[PDB]
């Protein structure tokens, strides 16, 4: 056995951070590499806390089904984990524009002044704080059943604009709105989403009453600035429930 | 959802009655043959995927109009969904066989099936025939009376639980028709 | 999913809306007085 | 209504699956603890009167200031209500053994009761002085069997854990 | 993976609860079966070199077209990878005989299964020719105890009903 | 049904635009290249009674195991059933010939195709046994013209490559 | 830039499908149609300094209030910054010929152009009046061929309908 | 998430072999003290509402500079948060004692907890002092040697479980230090 001394690169995880010079360059890029991992624990802390209201007393609920046939549950996160690759594949202005859009919407539902600071500094938390609020207070499109044939037109009228930002300035398709990546996945997304739809209209009689007032409150708090804008939200809740947050493509 | 134990208390909380040993003799008579319940839940999942293949071919052989353009079970998409929902109602009635009583079948499967099976145009006479296949097949497994298969169970009296699951497909046929 | 207008195939809302229950309570009350 | 049944069949539903072996396995163990938690019911359902009789003065021997004016127990029907309210708690636990889970308490006594007691200005410490007496007024070999008394204490301290 | 306790400890993690008497009675079921169900798990371990020569040759003798060129079983050494997939899988049934549930079979033998067979022209009906014959070679008086046989058949036809 | 012109009047409907210069330039290709694929429509619809006949007997020549009991083709009532299924497949490719795109296949012969055959035990190898033979069976002057053979085959293997 | 082929590959990517015969037919109509619309591009590129001179002062003839003190074209540097914008829009309609669609106009010349002209007090009627003078002065058998003229004019009015 | 039983199969499948004789010896014994293991965690979850104040008032009364102005428990919102992380840690440790493996402990509770507390500014020394009281409380609750609560128990050994729960708390202390 020859006496192999430890490498000089292996020794460079044993030094002290000094300020003046190249030492600050490596000190910066390992701090924010770990500040990113703080947000991923910040975002996950509120993600399963809001999810903890969905399962109310330990028994699971019909809202949080992930599949209904044999292969239905397993194919879901193949779409999800590849969509996460498509989210961070965006450009600069698609990303910084979505940073400042959530900072305009998270700022107008924060109850605390600490909670305001938690959304400004950590952008992956301000994102999932919006998304978790719509899951528990069911103000998504995927939970809104329109109560009339005009509302099904009125909800269809607004998401034609919401789908219109899933395409670029010239009309070619963005990477955001996309329903498949492999042979047969896009058809499997269709047979998935109807079981969400049959169970969205399968709530109790006491929970349709709750999100009726909530989606009306959801539209007139974050998107409405005038009196007519809070008239379509008071009168047709599902039309206000389909108002997305403009950082998506769909 | 409720089980065979959340049935006795809801019929006492409506009268504010203490659950004493007057009606606890039937809960002592529930666990008495309580082995044979899950010794019957094994008798569905053991060959579950071939069950609806016996059903939908029995639906096609009895009513052969579904293969025509205009029959519901026509296309590869529309045969799939009938193959998809022939399983799903079998899954939920296995829960009602398991849980002791059918308060989960009437709350997560029948909650709006009768209206989406008239607003879509699904033939309710073949639908009650699809159920009528899978009611007579359960009593060929829970009584070990399959023609192409025997199953090793401890032999005894179990047919009171055979009429139990026969009381349950007569709750899903009594839902959509 | 999307609205019924575009990008979706089959029908929805197998749920008795608030007008739809008003017709049935009318009809049961009418068969009784009949 | 949480139990060993409705937990393994509701979680299995979200994955879209049949009863597995493990879902079958737990309800075998439901019959193993069955002979104890059944047995504690008819003693509680048989002599519920004297148990809630000793549960209410334990509110009062610690806090006799409730009989003051301006307080929670000033007239008779504010105390005649109170013996019934802990009776409802001592009847909820009889429902809580028979299902064998955290079923009846979490729906009918724990959900939102932090605002029922606060806005009506009831002392929430007066409730936990009552049920933390029957948890240790109870003998192990005399009251019931030694094994079923392990279950009976196991629910009262959960209710003690909840209101406090 | 999906055991008797990993579900019931995550069905209380999701609600943010502490594990109570529904979550604890579930593990009493992991004793009164696991005495019986572990009688067969190591019986599979000793004779595991003979079960693959029990079913894997009765497959090729019955579905005998597979030895022509233009098939998957055309050459000699590709047959060995088709023999390896029997003690890849009933290896996993021994692994799921010990962990109570079906978890290590689901993540490692069912998740991502059908996409590979449908691409590489591996007919899954010739898979179940071996396995449902292995399902019907269990001679439960001679082979093992009674109840560990129906804990061996039940994990076996879980694989027929999911390859199908 | 996806075609050459509904893939551009839907892409302009998505952006909320009027019909631009680009989408008209597409439908010009649905004049020149459209003439060949509708010429080939009369080749297939005129002799469809025998391309189901020269393909169904090739299924029972390569895979000769299906006539046995317990298989997919156990009797006569299912053999002609199998012969019937070949007739549907190029019927839709005649529909795809006149529509211009892959319209009546992705909705009718691809949508949920694999989920059906896996239940009733139908090999995708036996469905592509019919189609892959008749793909490179035709000779370019006799069956149709030269460039129509480029149209017919490139629509033929699409049903092969997606079912496999 | 939206063009003939970027939209059909982006609609095939957004469903995950391979390039079909639909997308392969849609470029057949790009081959014959390029042999017309190309011949306006080099024709305009060779003679652009005479078009924008005529099309420039045909704005200061229709509106001569622009040279009043306070308005857009008051001094000579502001007049030169008006002729340059005509030369910009002549480039982006030259680019739309060679790209094959409306792409380079509504990326660099239409998007946001409503808000710059409103803020900087530029009248958009003066922009469509300098474009429409070029659209009507177009001798269809002299300046180009027939089908090069139906394509060169089809972008000059898409720009007009954009700016109003 | 793994447990003790599913730890065996991964190491059995690290080297791709069966389960023979030499592996289930720590599993046939693991179900022997499993009946003690239910008696173990029934003691910890019966008192965690009483334990977390018994361990967060101790970290105040030792270092009273936390409730000073500018301290990390100063306002009434800071205190309510710190009373909740001490209930989360005592919730996830109680999972790992029932699982018999720390695989749940640093995928759902501890993975990234350190640099979360780095970015928040939660003092790392006063947090181990918070944790270790709950370690010294659980070992005095498992072996029934609390000062103020003696419970009814089957007589016998229990120090092996107190040895196991003492190995989980210092994983929390090591993960953030
Ligand atoms: C402040 C300076 C200060 C405290 C606050 C208090 C905290 C403390 N407690 C221990 C040891 C235990 N604490 C326990 C918790 C409880 N005891 C009970 O009996 C009830 C159920 C619960 C209160 C609701 C327990 C069980 C112990 C173990 C022994 C026992 O039987 O009580 C310590 C560490 C030990 C020490 O340092 O002496 C601390 C800091 N004590 C304070 O000094
Ligand atoms: C109500 C929503 C919820 C909570 C809370 C939770 O813990 N899990 C979901 C529902 C749920 N799902 C299962 C079982 C599975 N869930 C999935 C989906 C996962 N796969 C993914 O790619 C992602 C995105 C990160 C997730 C969440 C899968 C594949 C399964 C297993 C399917 C199988 O074949 O076993 C359960 C528990 C039941 C179980 O079997 O674990 C719950 C509550
Ligand atoms: C993203 C939101 C989209 C915009 C914007 C748009 O214009 N079109 C969307 C993307 C897109 N999707 C397809 C093709 C399919 N999409 C499918 C999913 C839908 N079908 C359903 O049943 C459901 C749930 C109810 C959904 C979302 C399916 C299926 C297809 C067909 C896949 C195939 O292989 O044929 C396309 C291509 C154009 C088209 O409509 O086919 C685009 C651009
Ligand atoms: C499939 C192999 C299953 C299986 C299923 C069982 N099916 C049973 C009875 C049954 N079978 C049919 C359809 C059959 N009869 C027909 O005339 C035609 C074709 C036109 C077919 C496919 C029906 C309608 C019924 C219901 C009762 C009846 O009418 O006979 C059955 C019970 C009897 C037995 O087989 O012993 C079983 C077990 N068997 C299996 O093992 C896999 C899972
Ligand atoms: C007396 C020593 C008690 C006490 C009792 C009071 N309870 C009062 C109101 C009240 N309490 C409950 C909860 C109880 N009733 C139930 O039905 C159930 C379970 C399902 C429980 C736990 C309810 C729902 C109500 C309102 C309706 C009612 O009057 O019963 C009350 C009156 C307060 C007021 O009216 O403002 C009293 C005095 N109060 C005490 O301090 C001790 C604990
Ligand atoms: C009646 C509605 C009209 C009229 C129609 C005719 N148009 C004729 C020919 C023609 N137009 C275009 C340009 C247009 N066709 C395209 O394919 C595209 C882009 C994809 C565009 C913008 C073309 C290319 C042609 C064909 C002749 C050529 O090579 O340029 C036409 C000629 C006869 C025919 O259709 O074959 C007629 C009658 N013409 C009229 O006078 C009235 C007003
Ligand atoms: C032999 C060439 C085949 C084969 C064919 C069989 N198919 C059987 C039943 C069957 N097939 C289909 C799909 C069919 N419907 C469609 O709409 C289309 C195309 C769009 C097709 C191909 C369905 C829906 C059914 C069930 C109803 C029916 O009988 O038609 C079948 C009988 C199976 C049985 O006994 O139940 C056979 C033999 N089988 C083979 O092995 C190769 C692949
Ligand atoms: C050390 C932590 C303790 C101690 C532990 C022991 N517990 C013993 C036995 C035991 N515990 C239970 C209850 C447990 N099993 C269940 O099924 C349920 C509820 C679902 C629970 C909470 C039972 C049933 C038993 C068996 C005796 C009985 O019939 O009660 C025990 C005996 C040996 C052993 O089981 O391995 C010990 C040593 N005992 C102590 O002295 C300290 C305080
Ligand atoms: C062998 C069992 C491994 C394997 C080893 C390779 N390591 C290579 C470079 C390298 N190795 C170490 C490890 C060692 N040196 C140290 O100073 C310390 C402690 C601080 C340790 C553990 C280090 C740090 C490095 C990078 C520094 C350097 O050598 O320049 C290496 C060369 C790869 C190449 O030629 O580019 C190999 C092959 N690789 C293997 O696959 C097996 C599993
Ligand atoms: C609503 C505010 C959003 C929206 C979100 C989407 N959710 C999608 C799938 C999905 N998300 C959840 C989590 C949900 N369950 C909970 O328990 C809680 C709170 C604790 C929440 C938010 C579930 C159960 C599911 C279904 C299973 C799955 O993940 O597939 C989803 C589709 C993504 C996908 O297919 O994977 C979206 C887009 N939907 C909206 O349109 C608004 C913006
Ligand atoms: C098959 C034996 C039937 C039959 C079934 C069809 N169902 C179709 C659509 C459909 N099916 C269900 C039932 C099921 N899916 C669920 O998710 C749930 C509960 C959660 C249940 C009970 C639903 C809800 C739907 C609508 C959603 C969907 O599109 O799948 C269908 C095709 C409709 C279409 O695509 O146009 C068929 C053919 N039809 C029959 O003839 C027999 C009796
Ligand atoms: C001439 C027909 C108009 C007129 C135009 C003026 N435009 C002035 C500035 C200006 N113009 C544009 C759009 C143009 N510039 C670009 O870079 C591109 C795309 C590549 C386009 C289409 C912009 C963005 C700007 C502002 C920045 C700049 O100075 O270049 C302008 C000067 C404004 C001023 O100095 O006050 C004039 C005068 N004026 C006319 O007389 C008619 C109305
Ligand atoms: C998790 C998996 C799991 C199971 C499947 C059951 C397995 C099971 N079944 C029975 C036992 C039995 N099972 C049946 C059931 C039947 N006998 C018949 O003739 C019919 C075919 C069928 C339904 C009527 C009968 C009649 C008995 C004996 C009655 C009794 O045990 O009291 C017993 C008690 C006797 C024994 O030790 O085997 C057990 C443990 N328990 C489990 O833990
Ligand atoms: C849509 C397109 C389309 C077709 C191509 C034909 C397909 C076709 N060709 C032949 C029949 C034939 N086809 C050929 C041609 C050839 N034989 C070969 O082996 C060579 C590869 C190739 C030379 C070019 C010959 C020589 C026959 C007659 C011999 C025979 O196949 O029995 C037959 C059987 C006889 C019959 O027509 O009934 C059929 C169905 N029909 C159609 O509808």
From TrEMBL, chains D, E, F, G:
Task: Provide the binding site for (2R,3E)-phycocyanobilin.
Answer: 82
Protein's gene: peA
| Membrane-topology annotation of the record | Peripheral membrane protein
Identify the keywords attached in UniProt to this record, alphabetized. Answer: Antenna complex, Bile pigment, Chloroplast, Chromophore, Electron transport, Membrane, Photosynthesis, Phycobilisome, Plastid, Thylakoid, Transport
Can you cite an annotated GO cellular component?
phycobilisome
Q: Where in the cell is it found?
A: Plastid, Chloroplast thylakoid membrane
Listed InterPro entries: Globin-like_sf, Phycobilisome_asu/bsu, Phycobilisome_asu/bsu_sf
Please give the name of this protein. Answer: Phycoerythrin alpha subunit
UniProt keyword annotation of Transport present: yes
Annotated GO biological processes are: photosynthesis
Signal sequence span is: none
Entry's PANTHER family? C-PHYCOCYANIN ALPHA SUBUNIT, PHYCOBILISOME 32.1 KDA LINKER POLYPEPTIDE, PHYCOCYANIN-ASSOCIATED, ROD 2-RELATED
- Pfam families, per database record: Phycobilisome
Give the source's domain of life in one word. Eukaryota
Q: Which family does it belong to?
A: Belongs to the phycobiliprotein family.
- State if Chloroplast is listed as a keyword: yes
List the SUPFAM superfamilies. Globin-like
């Amino acid at each position: 056995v020859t006496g192999a001394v430890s490498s000089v690169n292996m020794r460079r995880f044993q030094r002290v951070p000094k300020v003046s010079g190249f030492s600050a360059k490596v000190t910066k890029k390992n701090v924010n590499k770990a500040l990113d991992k703080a947000d991923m624990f910040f975002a996950k802390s509120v993600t399963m806390e809001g999810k903890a209201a969905a399962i109310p007393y330990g028994v699971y609920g019909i809202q949080c089904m992930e599949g209904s046939a044999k292969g239905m549950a397993h194919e879901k996160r193949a779409m999800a984990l590849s969509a996460a690759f498509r989210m961070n594949q965006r450009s600069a202005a698609e990303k910084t524009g979505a940073m400042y859009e959530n900072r305009r919407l998270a700022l107008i539902l924060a109850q605390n002044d600490h909670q305001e600071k938690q959304y400004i500094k950590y952008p992956k938390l301000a994102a999932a704080a919006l998304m978790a609020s719509t899951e528990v207070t069911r103000a998504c499109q995927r939970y809104a059943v329109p109560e009339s044939i005009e509302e099904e037109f009125l909800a269809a009228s607004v998401d034609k604009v919401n789908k219109m930002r899933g395409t670029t300035a010239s009309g070619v398709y963005k990477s955001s709105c996309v329903e498949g990546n492999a042979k047969g996945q896009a058809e499997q997304a269709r047979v998935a989403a109807l079981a969400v739809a049959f169970r969205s209209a399968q709530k109790s009689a006491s929970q349709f009453a709750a999100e009726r007032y909530a989606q009306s409150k959801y539209g007139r708090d974050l998107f409405s600035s005038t009196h007519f804008e809070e008239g379509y939200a008071n009168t047709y809740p599902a039309m206000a429930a389909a108002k997305r947050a403009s950082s998506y493509g769909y | 959802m409720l089980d065979a134990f959340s049935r006795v208390v809801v019929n006492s909380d409506a009268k504010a009655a203490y659950v004493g040993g007057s009606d606890l003799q039937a809960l002592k008579s529930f666990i008495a043959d309580g082995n044979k319940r899950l010794d019957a839940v094994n008798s569905i999942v053991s060959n579950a995927s071939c069950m609806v293949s016996d059903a939908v071919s029995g639906m096609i052989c009895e009513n052969p109009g579904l293969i025509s353009p205009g029959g519901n079970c026509y296309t590869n998409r529309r045969m799939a969904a009938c193959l998809r929902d022939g399983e799903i109602i079998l899954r939920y009635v296995s829960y009602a066989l398991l849980a002791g009583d059918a308060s989960v079948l009437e709350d997560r499967c029948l909650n709006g099936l009768k209206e989406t099976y008239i607003a879509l145009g699904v033939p309710t006479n073949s639908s009650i025939r699809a159920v009528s296949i899978m009611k007579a097949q359960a009593v060929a497994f829970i009584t070990n009376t399959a023609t192409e298969r025997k199953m090793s169970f401890a032999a005894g009296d179990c047919t009171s639980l055979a009429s139990e699951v026969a009381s349950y497909f007569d709750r899903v046929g009594a839902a959509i028709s | 999913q999307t609205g019924l207008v575009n990008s979706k195939f089959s029908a929805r809302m197998a749920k008795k809306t608030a007008k739809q229950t008003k017709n049935k309570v009318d009809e049961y009350m009418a068969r009784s007085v009949q | 209504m949480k139990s060993v049944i409705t937990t393994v069949v509701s979680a299995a539903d979200a994955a879209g699956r049949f009863p597995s072996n493990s879902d079958l396995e737990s309800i075998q163990g439901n019959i193993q603890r069955s002979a104890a938690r059944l047995e504690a019911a008819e003693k509680l359902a048989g002599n519920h009167e004297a148990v809630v009789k000793e549960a209410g003065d334990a509110c009062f021997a610690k806090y006799a200031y409730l009989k003051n004016p301006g307080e929670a127990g000033e007239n008779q029907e504010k105390i005649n209500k109170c013996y019934r309210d802990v009776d409802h708690y001592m009847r909820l636990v009889n429902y809580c053994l028979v299902v064998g889970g955290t079923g009846p308490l979490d729906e009918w006594g724990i959900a939102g009761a932090r605002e029922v007691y606060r806005t009506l200005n009831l002392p929430t410490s007066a409730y936990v002085a009552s049920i933390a007496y029957t948890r240790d007024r109870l003998c192990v070999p005399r009251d019931m069997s030694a094994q079923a008394g392990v279950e009976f204490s196991a629910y009262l301290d959960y209710l003690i854990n909840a209101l406090s």
